[PDB]
Design a protein around this ligand. Structure first.
Ligand code: AM3
Length: 442
C-alpha cells in the first residue's frame, strides 16, 4: 500500500483567475468574455457570475496562508489578461500587475513554487469584439500580452503555461457554445484551434528571449476513451476521440508538424486553406506537457451524431462524470509512447461532491479523498513504468465558480461558505497535507 514518489516530485493545487478572484472590474481592469457571458441570461446555472466568486482579489494573502499551512509545495494559478491589459494590447494596468506581484512575492517567501497559466479562458472583451480566437491576429496580441507578463514577473516565476485546455477554449466555446464566447460555428472553432497553436508558439518564442532559467509548457484536457464493443467502427470511434479530444490535436502539430490523421479526415474543410504554412512555427520547442484528467468515457460509432458517449453503470461524481482512476495511468503511458515529452505534470485532477458542513463544523469529504487517492496511486504506477511525471496538482484549492455550472459544483480541498466567504479546510485538505509530507501514500 505504500507508494512513494521520486525525490523532488512537486505536489500542488490549482485555481484559475475568473473562478476565484471576483472584483473583475477592479482598479481599471477591462471586461473579460466570461464577465459578459455569465452576465447573459441563460448561459450559466442559477444566473451565477464570477462578480464575487471567492473574493480572492481581496483574500489572496489568507488563501496563500492556507497553502502554506497545508505544506503544499506548488501553486498553479492564472493571470487575468484584461486586468493587465484592459484593451487586450497597449496600456498596462499597474494595479493589475501589482495584484499578481504580491501573490508571487508571498508564494516565494513561503517556499511555494508558482506555476502561472498565462491564459485560462478570460480573454479581454475588447479582443472578442475584434473576433477573439477567430482572428489570426491574436497570435501577435497574445505575443505582446505574454511579453508583458515575462518582463514583469519572469525574474521570479520560472514555470509557465501558455494555454489551459485549448481544445475546450476552441470547441466548447466556439462549437458547442456552452462556454464563452458562446458561439456555434464549426469553421470558427477550427480557426480557433489553429490560432491557439500559433499563439502558444509565439509566446514560447518570446519566452526564450525574455526569461532566463525558466520552463514553459501547455496544458491539455484528456478523457480515457474506451470502445463500447470490439466492432471495428467502435475501435475507430475511440481513435478519433483520442486524436480530437486529447493531447494529440495539439501535440501532433507541436512535435510532428501537422494535425492527427483522423482529425484531418474530419476537419480539413474547416481549417484555413494554407494552415500547414504555420506548422514550422508551431513546432517551437516546449519544456513540458501538462495533462489534466478527470474521467473515463465509453464511446461508440453513431451515424446520427459520428460518435456518441454511452453512460456506464460506474461510480460518478456530482457532475455525473464516471470515476475511472486507471484512466490517468492510461493517458500518462500513452503520452510518453506517442510523443515522449521530456517532462509531464498532472496539472489538474479532482472531483466535485455534494459536500456537507457537519454539526462539528468540519467538512468530511472522504469521497473526494477516495477519488484523489485512487488517481495518485495510478499516477504512481505510471512513474514506476518510466513516465517522467514531475508533479501533481489537485483541482482545486478552493470551491469556486465552475463556469457554466456556477457555484453549485464544489471542487475545493477547502470549503467556501459563500454567505460569509469563510474558508473551512476539508478532510481532503488534511489528507492531502499528509500526502505532501510523506511524498506519497502510506
Ligand atoms: C461527460 C463528458 C464531460 C466531461 C468533462 C470533463 C471535465 C472537465 N474538466 C474540468 O473540471 C473542473 C476543472 C475546471 O473547470 C478548470 O477550470 C478547467 O481547466 C478543467 O476543464 N476542469
Amino acid at each position: 500500500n505504500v507508494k512513494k514518489f521520486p525525490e523532488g516530485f512537486l505536489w500542488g493545487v490549482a485555481t484559475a483567475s475568473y473562478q476565484i478572484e471576483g472584483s473583475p472590474l477592479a482598479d481599471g481592469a477591462g471586461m473579460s468574455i466570461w464577465h459578459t457571458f455569465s452576465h447573459t441570461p441563460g448561459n450559466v446555472k442559477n444566473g451565477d457570475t464570477g462578480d464575487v466568486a471567492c473574493d480572492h482579489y481581496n483574500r489572496w494573502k489568507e488563501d496563500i496562508e492556507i497553502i502554506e499551512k497545508l505544506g503544499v509545495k506548488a501553486y498553479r494559478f492564472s493571470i487575468s489578461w484584461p486586468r493587465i491589459l484592459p484593451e487586450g494590447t497597449g496600456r498596462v494596468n499597474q494595479k493589475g500587475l501589482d495584484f499578481y506581484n504580491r501573490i508571487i512575492d508571498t508564494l516565494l517567501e513561503k517556499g511555494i513554487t508558482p506555476f502561472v497559466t498565462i491564459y485560462h479562458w478570460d480573454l479581454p472583451f475588447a479582443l472578442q469584439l475584434k473576433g477573439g480566437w477567430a482572428n489570426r491576429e491574436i497570435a501577435d496580441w497574445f505575443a505582446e500580452y505574454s511579453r508583458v507578463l515575462f518582463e514583469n514577473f519572469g525574474d521570479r516565476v520560472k514555470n509557465w503555461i501558455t494555454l489551459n485546455e485549448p481544445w475546450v477554449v476552441a470547441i466548447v466555446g466556439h462549437l458547442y457554445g456552452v462556454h464563452a464566447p458562446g458561439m456555434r460555428d464549426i469553421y470558427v472553432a477550427f480557426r480557433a484551434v489553429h490560432n491557439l497553436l500559433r499563439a502558444h508558439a509565439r509566446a514560447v518564442k518570446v519566452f526564450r528571449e525574455t526569461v532566463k532559467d525558466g520552463k514553459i509548457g501547455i496544458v491539455f484536457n484528456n478523457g480515457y476513451f474506451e470502445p463500447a464493443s470490439e466492432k471495428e467502427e467502435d475501435i475507430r470511434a475511440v481513435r478519433f476521440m483520442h486524436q480530437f479530444n486529447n493531447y494529440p490535436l495539439f501535440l501532433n502539430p507541436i512535435y510532428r508538424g501537422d494535425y492527427p490523421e483522423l482529425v484531418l479526415e474530419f476537419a480539413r474543410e474547416y481549417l484555413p486553406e494554407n494552415y500547414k504554412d504555420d506548422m514550422s512555427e508551431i513546432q517551437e520547442k516546449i519544456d513540458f506537457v501538462g495533462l489534466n484528467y478527470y474521467s473515463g468515457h465509453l464511446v461508440k460509432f453513431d451515424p446520427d451524431a459520428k460518435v456518441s458517449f454511452v453512460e456506464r453503470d460506474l461510480p460518478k461524481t456530482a457532475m455525473g462524470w464516471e470515476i475511472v482512476p486507471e484512466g490517468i495511468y492510461w493517458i500518462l503511458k500513452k503520452v510518453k509512447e506517442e510523443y515522449n515529452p521530456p517532462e509531464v505534470y498532472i496539472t489538474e485532477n479532482g472531483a466535485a461532491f455534494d459536500d456537507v458542513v457537519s454539526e462539528d463544523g468540519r467538512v468530511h469529504d472522504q469521497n473526494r479523498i477516495d477519488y484523489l487517492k485512487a488517481h495518485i496511486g495510478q499516477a504512481w504506477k505510471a512513474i514506476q513504468e518510466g513516465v517522467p511525471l514531475k508533479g501533481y496538482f489537485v483541482w482545486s484549492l478552493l470551491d469556486n465558480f465552475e463556469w457554466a455550472e456556477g457555484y453549485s459544483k464544489r471542487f475545493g480541498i477547502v470549503y467556501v461558505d459563500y454567505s460569509t466567504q469563510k474558508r473551512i479546510v476539508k478532510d481532503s485538505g488534511y489528507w492531502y497535507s499528509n500526502v505532501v509530507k510523506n511524498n506519497g501514500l502510506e
